[PDB]
Design a protein around this nucleic acid. Structure first.
Ligand code: NA
Ligand code: NA
Length: 91
DNA sequence: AATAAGCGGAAGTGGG
DNA sequence: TCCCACTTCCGCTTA
């Protein structure tokens, strides 16, 4: 099954949830979630994964924080903003 | 207070 | 056995 960072990168490339997520600086790999429309994107992640419970942004962001140590995604000190690593972007 | 983003320890689930 | 890659739950902090 697809990994969360790849799910997000695929959405950003396809543009299918443009009102929920967007690039801030695609060259740097920085992206930002919609304050009002992030939950619809979280819901789609959980359904794609076939999880038992409804997915929420809180739980999705709990998973995102676990990438901080390995580096695929880092939190940026801006509201709802994160950054993919160069390695993730290159693939 | 009400709302919201952010945090992470701990334990549970999946598929190796 | 025991790690993967999250998921779920809970309590806390800051604005
Ligand atoms: Na967040
Ligand atoms: Na929030």
């Amino acid at each position: 099954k697809i990994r969360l960072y790849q799910f997000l990168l695929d959405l950003l490339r396809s543009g299918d949830m443009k009102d929920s997520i967007w690039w801030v600086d695609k060259d740097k790999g920085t992206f930002q979630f919609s304050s009002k429309h992030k939950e619809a994107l979280a819901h789609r992640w959980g359904i794609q994964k076939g999880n038992r419970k409804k997915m929420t942004y809180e739980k999705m962001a709990r998973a995102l924080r676990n990438y901080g140590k390995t580096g695929e995604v880092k939190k940026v000190k801006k509201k709802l903003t994160y950054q993919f690593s160069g390695e993730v972007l290159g693939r």
